[PDB]
């Protein structure tokens, strides 16, 4: 219907145009009669008639009298709904500043005038006079002059000089100033002054002035002469409550504002003394401030119940504001709620639903069908028929529920699968029945959990619900390719009990014709459910070109595993049902079924497996009892040993051999050892103790105990959750987190001591409070993630970009956390992968890596695969399908259009509730060892030493893959050589953790140059070996006398001539910094790789993810080499040491300040490339993006957040993190304007500058260069081109103020904009409509 939305500063004439009148009486209504006040806030003439086409007097009461006002009262007669849009204005006697521009953080009014805000709101509050047009005076146009100084000026500036005060005075200033003149005046100060901070302030002023010379806005408009009022129906009298008519809302603020305005009018016409008039003007200013934004001053005006009364800005911001309460998400009709019920008889495509709920929700449909069939002539009679619940109504109801999906909806819809469609099955009752499989997807319990049901109305709505939202269409969660409808708790236990074996069970040994015979034997009761019997199966495989071949063989198995064979579809092999079939096995089964058979066979197989699991779990009778949890017989002796050990430790501490700290550490260690021992004893008693024969003498099998079956199967439970039942509960921590010295030895099968239960409830309360805080933190993170997203949809199909990220299996010192098979699956490569054979196109350039390709990758032993990343995509206002990859919910490429920003945000934020809050190098296995970027010189010991700093051991096996990766500290000696085969279990590199060696690159004679004993390095004594060792004094500790001279170590030969670096004219000098112990004195020869000086030397929870996504700089940021070159030092650590890096070829205009306490891994004789770390500690993403590139920072953040998610046992595909990061760094800064219109200081969206410079480079012109910058989610979201999106997120007042100053027009084009407006969403079915609309323009 309508084009883009624009926002601008409201001109007073525009306000007059808006208003259909002018309110004068403060009074709203009469109580004598609910008729509105003649000139009050509720008024008929100003805002239209109260009743539908009736006047106040009632002279005209029919529709034919529309468009004519009354006579005695002169009120227009029209619809009452017109009263919801007619506005009015208040003619303020004295102009009042708008608080939004006044008390803004940047202070629009103050910044525009380039004067401090203290002065501004001093002159607003009538306690200091500004000097309008000072002219031929000492005082200037922008000058403060309080009462006494004003009198001092007045008594001797009695000329025509005038210095107005108040908001009128600032209006005078704003009128006097010319915006263009100020811009051209400040341009030369911008071009001249070299101060960074000062120029930053000048640009901020220039931006404000430019945003007013471009937009049709006048600076004077900020001061508001007329105050608009809302339509009365938007701020009504509130329900009568028996005539009480009372609520502290806008009506009250408007009443007080009108009262003050009338008082000012009376005083102005009365010519009251200036002090009283000034006080009343201050009161009016405070009233307008409270009206617009209450709480933007010290005292928030308070209504009844002594609470801040909601203002005109409290209803546009916050959770209860109009945006997030009525636009972003709004209540809906055709909706009902009830507790949920299992109802296993249902299929996941359908759900149970009460008759009353179907009758109430589908009332219009029932009325329509009744009218069509003629059962009721009219809607009114049909409605009565629905009330009578006549039997004919139920038959009609069954017709409108045949194929009408409903949207089951749980309240905390964390992710996409929170709401799913279902075909309602009419059930008698009052509880909605939810299919058991989708409970895991819903994260829904059956403990009073309630979920709303919504009824799609239009054919488009029902049809898209059926096509997309059906549980049949949602098998794989959007977070990862793993199935989401997997048998979760009880059916998995039934399958696990089904697929086991006794070594001697009834009916074991005989051969079975097939699964039918197995079912016949089990049901007849003459053969046990799980007995090892050979069966004949017709296994079907599709190894042909889609054709299924039949293989018949006698596979040894059990009866229970044979039962499942008739359930599985034809394509699945028998090797998947021949195991114990725990939770992981069933998940792998369902994934293979989805990837082989498809979707419909997977749905049918899931339903059948659910049926059989439930049925045979019922037949199993897998109960729980006291005898089912066994106490280890060795638990008593383990407890006795632990008590003896703690007694010995306490006795040692009493003597004084061990102090408190080491005693505490020893006790904790020995109690942990006892806990591990008792846990192992419990597991042995729970899975090994079972003794059962084989018709022979004796045999031992895996236990059939109830708790072991319910825990090992993965049905429900874990290692700690089973330890806390039979074994020692373990050391339980205090509130602060420090461990109680004495653990809760007693388990839950036995009783607990009162102190033991006190520690237990300490831990439980800590966990409950942690969960209560963590769910709120995760909700906030999900909101931020969604809103930094929601403008990113798959707009194209391909971009032809060769860029991407090189996907490599992640190694964090240990084993392979995620193999490349599960890391690149579903993503489209960027360049051809090759096997060890070179120039081999194993996988072509632009083929999606499905299961077959990934399986081929593993057997070809690939190491690193370059893949097209969503970050590297060059598509504007979206990304292409190929750069994203698989949908992760359907086995194909992402559909052109589907919104992936919201999918990624929900996938990231869903596990937020599941998160938390608080040497030597040894080879592991056999394999080759090669080093990357390594410089080594053979020493006299035959070992290997490293000259580079980022040498990093990668362990290559005989397959060519990197089994292990270890970081090599500088100077660490390597026992083995390059490419030397090593056997797992022996250390290859070892070093002193508290020592930084200065090992020499080339052996030879070293002369002590600039070494003075007494001034630079004092010869300290030694009380340990008897031979003194030279220790270099610290620069801060040593005086300036020994500080000016530069310590150095010159290398010479036997003839005394200097030795130069191989290939470098610079001699191999070495600098010794402070605190460097030099055992080797002068005249001592040094071999290669010999140490010269022995220089001596976190969170992973939800807050870590929040910091990572907000791009928070760490408390101790790691310094990275901004430029590549040699290192030089400047100041003598005068408070802040400065470091300068100069390249061999280029200039050195970069200087960095480094505090003394920061450890430096770099010296002044080595070459460091750009991005190499200098200090130690966490590195901010901003520096990584600036130096190492966008791909490097994307990889860093993806790896960090995945490692955070790894510890909690939750897996999220890296594409979600990648797209969120792409949305994070969508802003760019133009370092050189070039020929583009963009200014240098200006930062613009990367899409804008990319489009502009690609257009400029399309022809002979040269495009402008830019510098991309990374900013946090909560900062990228507000800093967006859409004002209506940033306003809806956070800081609504600031965003709206900046938009109104800018005059910027929102073009919609984002999911959340079109949601707020209420039009089609450019995400799914609306994407085609939006692209048609664009192509029609």
């Amino acid at each position: 219907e309508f084009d883009a939305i624009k926002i601008a500063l409201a001109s007073p004439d525009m306000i007059r145009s808006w208003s259909f009148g002018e309110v004068k009486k403060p009074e709203t209504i009469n109580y004598r009669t609910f008729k509105p006040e003649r000139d009050g806030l509720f008024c008929a003439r100003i805002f239209g008639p109260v009743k539908d086409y009736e006047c106040l007097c009632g002279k005209y009461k029919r529709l034919k009298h529309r468009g004519v006002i009354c006579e005695k009262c002169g009120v227009e007669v029209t619809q009452t709904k017109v009263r919801r849009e007619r506005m009015g204005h208040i003619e303020l006697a004295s102009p009042t500043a708008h608080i939004w521009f006044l008390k803004s953080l940047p202070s629009r009014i103050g910044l525009l005038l380039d004067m401090p805000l203290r002065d501004i709101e001093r002159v607003l509050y009538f306690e200091s006079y500004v000097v309008i047009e000072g002219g031929m005076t000492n005082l200037e146009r922008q000058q403060i002059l309080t009462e006494e100084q004003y009198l001092d000026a007045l008594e001797e500036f009695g000329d025509e000089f005038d210095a107005k005060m108040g908001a009128e005075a600032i209006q005078a200033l704003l009128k006097s100033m010319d915006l263009e003149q100020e811009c051209e005046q400040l341009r030369e100060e911008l071009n001249e002054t070299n101060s960074e901070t000062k120029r930053k302030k000048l640009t901020k002023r220039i931006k404000l002035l430019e945003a007013f010379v471009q937009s049709g806005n006048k600076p004077e408009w900020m001061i508001l002469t007329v105050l608009p009022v809302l339509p009365p129906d938007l701020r009504p009298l509130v329900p009568l409550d028996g005539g009480r008519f009372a609520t502290s809302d806008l009506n009250d603020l408007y009443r007080r504002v009108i009262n003050r305005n009338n008082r000012l009018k009376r005083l102005l016409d009365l010519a009251a003394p200036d002090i009283i008039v000034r006080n009343e003007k201050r009161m009016l200013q405070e009233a307008v401030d409270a009206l617009l934004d209450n709480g933007r001053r010290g005292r928030a005006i308070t209504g009844s119940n002594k609470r801040p009364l909601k203002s005109l800005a409290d209803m546009i911001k916050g959770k209860q504001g109009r945006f997030r309460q009525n636009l972003l998400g709004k209540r809906v009709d055709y909706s009902g709620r009830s507790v949920i019920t299992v109802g296993p008889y249902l299929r996941l495509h359908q759900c149970g639903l009460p008759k009353k709920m179907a009758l109430e929700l589908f009332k219009p449909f029932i009325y329509g069908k009744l009218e069509l069939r003629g059962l009721a002539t009219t809607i009114k009679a049909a409605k009565k028929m629905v009330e009578r619940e006549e039997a004919v109504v139920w038959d009609i109801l069954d017709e409108v529920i045949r194929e009408h999906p409903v949207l089951l909806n749980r309240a905390p819809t964390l992710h996409r699968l929170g709401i799913q469609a279902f075909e309602p099955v009419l059930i008698e009752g009052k509880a909605i029945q939810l299919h058991p499989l989708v409970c895991a997807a819903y994260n829904a319990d059956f403990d009073g959990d309630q979920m709303a049901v919504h009824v799609p109305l239009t054919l488009e709505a029902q049809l898209e619900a059926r096509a997309l939202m059906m549980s049949t269409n949602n098998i794989l969660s959007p977070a990862n390719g793993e199935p989401i409808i997997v048998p979760s708790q009880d059916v998995v236990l039934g399958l696990y009990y089904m697929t086991r074996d006794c070594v001697n069970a009834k009916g074991e040994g005989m051969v079975l014709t097939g699964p039918k015979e197995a079912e016949r034997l089990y049901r007849s009761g003459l053969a046990s459910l799980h007995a090892r019997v050979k069966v004949r199966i017709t296994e079907y495989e599709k190894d042909a070109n889609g054709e299924l071949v039949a293989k018949t063989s006698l596979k040894d198995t059990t009866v229970g595993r044979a039962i499942l064979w008739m359930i599985v579809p034809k394509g699945l092999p028998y090797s998947i049902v021949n195991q114990a079939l725990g939770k992981k096995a069933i998940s792998k089964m369902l994934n293979t079924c989805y990837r082989i058979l498809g979707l419909k066979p997977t749905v049918i197989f899931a339903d059948q497996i659910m049926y059989t699991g439930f049925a045979y779990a019922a037949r199993s009778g897998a109960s729980v009892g006291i005898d089912d949890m066994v106490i280890p017989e060795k638990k008593h002796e383990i407890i006795s040993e632990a008590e003896a050990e703690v007694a010995e430790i306490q006795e040692q501490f009493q003597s004084g051999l061990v102090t408190a700290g080491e005693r505490y550490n020893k006790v904790i260690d020995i109690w942990a050892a006892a806990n591990d021992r008792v846990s192992k004893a419990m597991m042995d008693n729970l899975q090994t103790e079972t003794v059962i024969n084989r018709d022979g003498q004796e045999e031992k099998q895996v236990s059939f105990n109830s708790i072991y079956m319910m825990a090992d199967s993965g049905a429900r439970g874990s290692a700690a959750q089973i330890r806390q039942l039979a074994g020692m509960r373990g050391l339980m921590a205090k509130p602060d987190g420090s461990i109680i010295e004495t653990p809760i030895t007693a388990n839950f099968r036995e009783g607990l001591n009162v102190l033991q239960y006190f520690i237990s409830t300490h831990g439980a309360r800590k966990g409950l409070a942690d969960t209560a805080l963590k769910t709120a933190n995760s909700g906030y993170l999900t909101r931020r993630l969604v809103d930094v997203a929601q403008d990113l949809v798959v707009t194209e199909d391909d971009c032809g970009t060769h860029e991407g990220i090189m996907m490599t299996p992640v190694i964090e010192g240990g084993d392979v956390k995620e193999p490349l098979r599960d890391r690149v699956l579903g993503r489209v490569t960027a360049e051809d992968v090759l096997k060890p054979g070179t120039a081999d196109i194993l996988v072509p350039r632009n083929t999606l890596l499905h299961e077959q390709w990934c399986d081929l990758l593993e057997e070809n032993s690939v190491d690193a695969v370059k893949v097209r990343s969503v970050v590297s995509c060059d598509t504007d206002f979206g990304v292409c399908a190929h750069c994203y990859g698989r949908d992760l919910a359907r086995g194909h490429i992402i559909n052109k259009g589907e919104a992936i920003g919201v999918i990624a945000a929900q996938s990231i934020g869903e596990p937020g509730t599941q998160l938390t809050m608080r040497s030597s190098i040894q080879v592991k296995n056999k394999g080759s060892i090669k080093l990357s970027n390594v410089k080594s010189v053979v020493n006299s010991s035959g070992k290997l030493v490293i000259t580079s700093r980022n040498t990093e051991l990668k362990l290559i096996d005989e397959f060519g893959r990197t089994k292990e990766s270890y970081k090599v500290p500088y100077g660490a000696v390597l026992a083995k050589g390059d490419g030397e085969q090593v056997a797992g279990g022996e250390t290859v590199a070892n070093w002193d953790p508290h020592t930084m060696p200065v090992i020499t690159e080339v052996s030879g004679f070293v002369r002590f140059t600039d070494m003075i004993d007494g001034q630079t390095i004092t010869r300290q004594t030694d009380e340990l070996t008897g031979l003194s060792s030279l220790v270099v004094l610290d620069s801060a500790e040593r005086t300036a006398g020994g500080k000016d001279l530069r310590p150095a170590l010159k290398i010479v030969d036997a003839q005394g001539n200097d030795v130069l670096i191989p290939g470098t004219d610079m001699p191999a000098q070495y600098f010794l910094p402070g605190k460097a112990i030099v055992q080797l004195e002068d005249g001592v020869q040094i071999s290669s790789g010999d140490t010269l000086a022995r220089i001596p030397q976190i969170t992973g929870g939800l807050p870590r993810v929040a910091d990572l996504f907000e791009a928070r700089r760490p408390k101790e940021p790691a310094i990275l080499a901004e430029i590549s070159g040699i290192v030089s030092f400047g100041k003598e650590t005068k408070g802040k040491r400065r470091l300068v890096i100069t390249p061999v070829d280029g200039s050195d205009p970069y200087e960095e300040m480094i505090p003394k306490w920061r450890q430096l891994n770099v010296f002044e004789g080595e070459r460091v490339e750009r991005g190499d770390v200098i200090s130690d500690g966490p590195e901010a993403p901003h520096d990584i993006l600036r130096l190492r590139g966008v791909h490097a920072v994307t990889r860093y953040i993806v790896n960090e957040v995945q490692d955070v998610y790894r510890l909690q046992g939750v897996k999220i595909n890296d594409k979600h993190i990648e797209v969120i990061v792409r949305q994070m760094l969508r802003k760019a800064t133009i370092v050189n304007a070039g020929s583009s219109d963009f200014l240098e200081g200006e930062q613009v969206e990367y899409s804008r500058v990319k489009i502009a410079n690609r257009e400029l480079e399309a022809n002979g012109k040269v495009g402008a260069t830019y510098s991309r910058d990374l900013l946090g989610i909560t900062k990228a979201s507000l800093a967006t081109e859409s004002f209506i999106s940033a306003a809806s997120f956070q800081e609504t007042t600031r965003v709206l103020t900046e938009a109104a100053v800018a005059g910027k027009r929102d073009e919609l084009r984002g999911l959340k904009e079109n949601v707020i407006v209420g039009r089609l969403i450019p995400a799914g079915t609306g994407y085609a409509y939006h692209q048609d609309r664009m192509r029609r323009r």
Binding site: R466, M470, K896
Partner: protein
Amino acid sequence: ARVTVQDAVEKIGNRFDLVLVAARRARQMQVGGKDPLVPEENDKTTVIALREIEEGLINNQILDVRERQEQQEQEAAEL
């Protein structure tokens, strides 16, 4: 009756244009007197449109050309 729309989306590889075309088909069936080509089995319009798409005889191109022909004989009705 139908449970899943898989074969339909292998017929129409968009999963989004499928909804639009079947919605147009359902609109033709309800608002107009159009007879569904697959005979119904006591099925609603929104599912019989998906049945029509499943057999492959109804999609965006056939629907567009069919409505274009209907418009053509609509001009030709008055000669």
